[model samples]
Target: ESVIESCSNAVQGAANDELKVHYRANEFPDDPVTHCFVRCIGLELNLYDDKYGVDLQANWENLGNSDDADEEFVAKHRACLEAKNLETIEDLCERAYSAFQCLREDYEMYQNNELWSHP
Candidate 1:
């Protein structure tokens, strides 16, 4: 199974009682279950932190180390990391969800060549 599919199944087996919600590509849940789901993906990558949050630098290092990566890719990754910051949201799960959203949005921009479109 793909990493994401494996993580989703694992998270559901452990917490969601083998029942999982089906979300569209653009849909993200704000509740605890979904938050946990997001965290599980990070955990699977070994880039997650129970306290310090996801190890984005290490995660990106793995991806950005590739030949496809350059200054623009690095910049886009940095911008997404900045978007993941949410001082007002204290819950780790919620923060993880937000980070996931930001990263997806950044990905969308990258696909559309709209890197600086976000405010």
Candidate 2:
């Protein structure tokens, strides 16, 4: 199992090296804040990827593994037509405003739970 061990070691070593490089970077405005932010963002991205990215990968894999679902394939083709048919700037602005409102509410809730719990 030397080959397997070497591959695993290489992956772990690369990840560790990247973490150290990012940890020592001057891109963070403050060292402590940057460290905390990196950890938080990394954790969030990991969680999101586990949930949504895994589902997407599974869907793509299923599509590649099967060849018999003609109706389902047609439905997928039709779904591609649902993009970017908005008629006006006002509609886009309203959609953006709704998104911003939802984000603000979620931010307040997250801050109340995560940030306020620290101190």
Candidate 3:
């Protein structure tokens, strides 16, 4: 399968299995690509962490609001793509995964108790 297909399938599978939450493209129609990319990156990151038995935290405190955080993530993602370096890709992927996990968890805890209540 292609990268996008693979990522989409994986995300769907995660949602099915209750390991993570999934968002439909229609929910963010104006920026579906961005939303999908962020989710894919996050899943890959989390998988990497589990495979490596690591405990690193993905920080996303300023992701939605801080320009610097956005720039940094974009730079790393671009570097991974340009270099085709598995290590860089893995690092960025894991960072995204951890960030997503934290965000989802926090949302479930405070903002939206039903964030992942659906199957």
Q: Over the stretch 1-119, how does candidate 2's per-residue lDDT look in tens digits? A: 34223322443232344444543441222233333333333233331121111112222233343333355433442233223221232342332222122223323444455111001
Best by TM-score: 1
Q: Is candidate 1 or candidate 3 better by TM-score?
A: 1
Clashes of each: 0, 0, 4
The segments of candidate 3 whose C-alpha lies over 4 angstroms from its true place after superposition are 1-5, 10-22, 25-41, 45-48, 51-57, 61-102, 105-119
**lDDT of candidate 1 at residue 80, scale 0 to 100:** 68
| Best prediction by lDDT | 1
Residue pairs in candidate 2 whose N, alpha carbon or C atoms collide under 3 angstroms:
none
Instruction: Please say which candidate is ahead in TM-score: 2 or 3.
Output: 3
Compose the digit string of candidate 1's lDDT tens values, residues 23-82.
324244567777877777666776555555445454554444434335665576556656
lDDT of each: 0.56, 0.30, 0.36
Ranking by lDDT: 1, 3, 2
TM-score on alpha carbons, each prediction? 0.53, 0.18, 0.24
